[PDB]
From a paper:
Aminoacyl-tRNA synthetases (aaRSs) are an essential enzyme family for protein translation and, in several cases, have been validated drug targets. Among the aaRSs, prolyl-tRNA synthetase (PRS) is a validated drug target in Plasmodial spp and Toxoplasma gondii (Tg). In the current study, we examined five ATP-mimetics L95, L96, L97, L35, and L36, based on the 1-(pyridin-4-yl) pyrrolidin-2-one (PPL) scaffold. We successfully co-crystallized all five compounds with TgPRS (L95, L96, L97, L35, and L36) and three with HsPRS (L95, L96, and L97), all in complex with L-pro.
Numbering used by the authors:
A (entry chain B): 331 to 408, 417 to 626, 632 to 779, 790 to 830
B (entry chain A): 331 to 408, 417 to 626, 632 to 786, 793 to 830
Write the structure that this text describes.
Amino acid sequence: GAMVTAKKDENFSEWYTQAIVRSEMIEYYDISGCYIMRPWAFHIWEKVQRFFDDEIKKMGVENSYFPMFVSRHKLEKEPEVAWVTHYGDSPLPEKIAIRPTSETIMYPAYAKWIRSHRDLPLKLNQWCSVVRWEFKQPTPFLRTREFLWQEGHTAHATEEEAWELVLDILELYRRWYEECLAVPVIKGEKSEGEKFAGGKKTTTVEAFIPENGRGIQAATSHLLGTNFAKMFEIEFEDEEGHKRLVHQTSWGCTTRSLGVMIMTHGDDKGLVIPPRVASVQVVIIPILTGEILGKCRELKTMLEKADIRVRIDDRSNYTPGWKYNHWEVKGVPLRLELGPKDLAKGTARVVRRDTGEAYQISWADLAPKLLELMEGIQRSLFEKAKARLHEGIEKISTFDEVMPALNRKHLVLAPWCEDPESEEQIKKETQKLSEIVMTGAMKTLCIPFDQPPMPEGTKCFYTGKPAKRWTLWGRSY
Amino acid sequence: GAMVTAKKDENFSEWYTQAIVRSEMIEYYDISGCYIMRPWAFHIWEKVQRFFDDEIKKMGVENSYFPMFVSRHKLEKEPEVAWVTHYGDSPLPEKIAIRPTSETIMYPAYAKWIRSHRDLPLKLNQWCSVVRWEFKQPTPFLRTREFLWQEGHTAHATEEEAWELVLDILELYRRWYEECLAVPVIKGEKSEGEKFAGGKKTTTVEAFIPENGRGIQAATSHLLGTNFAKMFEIEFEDEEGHKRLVHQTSWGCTTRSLGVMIMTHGDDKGLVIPPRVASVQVVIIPILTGEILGKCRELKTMLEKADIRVRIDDRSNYTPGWKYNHWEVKGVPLRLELGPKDLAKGTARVVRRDTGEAYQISWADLAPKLLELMEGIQRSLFEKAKARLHEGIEKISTFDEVMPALNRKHLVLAPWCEDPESEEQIKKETQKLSEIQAIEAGDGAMKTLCIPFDQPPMPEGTKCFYTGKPAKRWTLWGRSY
Ligand SMILES: Cc1cc(N2CC[C@](C#N)(C3(C)CC3)C2=O)cc(C(=O)NCc2cc(F)cc(-c3cnn(C)c3)c2)n1
Ligand SMILES: Cc1cc(N2CC[C@](C#N)(C3(C)CC3)C2=O)cc(C(=O)NCc2cc(F)cc(-c3cnn(C)c3)c2)n1
Ligand code: PRO
Ligand code: PRO
């Protein structure tokens, strides 16, 4: 048999490795930092990809594909980049490099395509792989040297429109995590030191892993503004003849979501998959003759008439207990058992994956009851995570409250004056205090949109200067 | 005013570039061999990809994604590969390679995954890009140094099942080209020298460009057989305990398809895009003031209720004829003109892209008539291309018939004994003659395309059209891409 023996609330690392390995999600590779995405993990990426694609196509964004290579001189305009130097056995003219981001590849094309305001807005997106090479230790799904992602780049006439689309894409990411993956995220504004290089303002959705008390950036949505139009000479004309700079936005989302989705919902038994991204929503396990096996196909067709995803585990050379454990660690939401007594009884027995609750349902009520079951499972999966999230955040006043809260594996919400030097000072002294496999330092995660009230007079929690906004702090990824 | 000045049947080389550039399908990148696929071609790639994906999901094939790099030792296991050596300024402990094809990447994992007969069959597929860095003349879509594709790799317990899957995948490719792209292909078997390296037998579909009389391999499906399992120790335990080798198949299809489609259908005006893959099936062009745009949007919604892809070109800054030409070079099959005189009569004037025939349809009859018209356009495009294909293939007996046919921009179906030395000699001999021909012109070899599945009868005996040996089968020959 193949199941999970590690406990999630003890050795979280080994539990994560077991849950993602013993569920046929990843496979190791001989090249460090890279992993093989098996179909069970990929059919979730497919669902979130199709959803986000439909949504951005409703916004008018069109898909495209730009090369994976970039000339050296077009990238030298403002590391962890990999370069190509040979073709078989001979050297090339210029050493071309692999894309860590397609701004320097697409924007030369944007300047050529954009001439008049009638060419705006230009909204492009592409689904591609991206290489980011670091010495540091790799972690599956979260810190991968080569990850799949979507990256969209838009160019608008005015900054108002650009900012509006930035926020719309951030809302799309919020739905991606909260509605599709049932992982609660916090919308926020990035720090000046934590924001995208060369951009004006960077928006983000942040997630929280309670087991290690670490924050992690789910997705990102940037307002580049005109800072990149200067770098790449992307200009247009209004109906007055005046050459003006375009306002650019860029945004992206990786397979890191999947990893987050796992840590938020897996338990000591393995995976739990929200019914909205589950490749197989209901698995039918026949228990043994032709009558039972043929009735299972009738029930499969019936549930497929309700757009439910059903696979019958008619595999004969496998004990039913092995199928139980197999699909338990797989994370399938509802498992459906049908034996001979069930077929005679005219009912079936389903066991939900989140709580283990058993249900006896008649065949005439099977489809709507399973719909209600999946909806309730998704809602509860999201609510438990929301509760853990808000119990993992502490509202503080001074810095003397920081180190206890960090030790409780929590985050802090503090009044901050946004002095960029103060953030580095705070990181340094939090690391120093933690010193007494990753750092113990505390940095900014975001400046949440849902801003709590700032009282009449107020004070920064570190420098004592007048505080500007509430900031989320914590040990991060 | 992006038009197409070139003539397709005169300067075809330039016509292709004009048709693909002034439709805003491709854009040029500073690195040779790499091209930017703008949305107008990518929304065709999207449709063919959704089609093939649904169809292979019916076959139990599940999608995945393997890394884009391969180790040196695992790749050199028995070229045109791009090798990564540095990160920033520092070199690497081992040099890695960018994938030309992911056999050496997936198959080490196959060896780990297959243990018993219960793990078989195993059907994987991935949609990604591959980098073949040939340093010859790059052609958009046709021969690029970086191109998108799907590659599917399967492993079975017996070879009959593997070959069955091979032929099913090849049929899926024939549907991809003839039912989606409306481009006729020929199913066939690759020669012993042109088959996939290390494989047992390669099946293929071939397409024909008449303007330069060239054959081009549309897609491919390989029977690797037992050969790769020997390389990567991919074995399983039989139902009886005997340890045996898997039988593997590998198949793939690239963006080249799109390219071929263009060459098959575009005319002197620009693109012609088959309606089953077109991003905009019907373009509504207001003749230019809300009285007209309102009815345009009403018709847009009504046609959308019939799953018709409609975009209304309400850009008031251009003349209607400019819009006509702009959506003609893009190859939109149907153009719906709605003038102010049309609003009182309650009709609209629809013009199709392939023939130019113009119809005037009532608003109520709009949806079913446009459905019928798109079906007819698809049928007529494919049937015209199929007739052109059968006009361009010459059935021959002697090598004396070869050079005439090749000079007519044609292919030859000839009885062949299938000895590989014979193929190489015919290649060299056709080149050594086409060059002597072109000497007196102020400025060409022929190779095997496929051994078609629909073999004509082979009379008793019959001599190979080049060597005089007893002929095996009718092979396709022509100048290749
Ligand atoms: C899956 C994924 C997604 C990402 N991004 C980047 C873009 C983004 C999106 N979208 C955001 C901007 C974050 C939202 C995303 O998810 C970034 C990375 C990444 O740095 N991988 C390189 C790498 C390899 C490795 F072996 C180890 C490390 C490492 C780092 N610190 N330590 C201690 C080890 C890092 N890996
Ligand atoms: C788009 C694409 C698809 C392919 N495959 C991959 C799979 C396949 C499909 N489908 C099949 C093998 C046909 C089944 C296909 O077409 C192969 C290639 C390719 O060799 N590109 C490298 C290249 C660059 C270049 F600048 C020039 C040349 C060149 C070659 N001869 N001359 C005179 C110039 C070649 N380019
Ligand atoms: O990688 C990043 O962080 C940004 C967002 C997508 C494109 N560049
Ligand atoms: O590259 C090729 O020719 C084959 C097609 C599938 C993968 N390998």
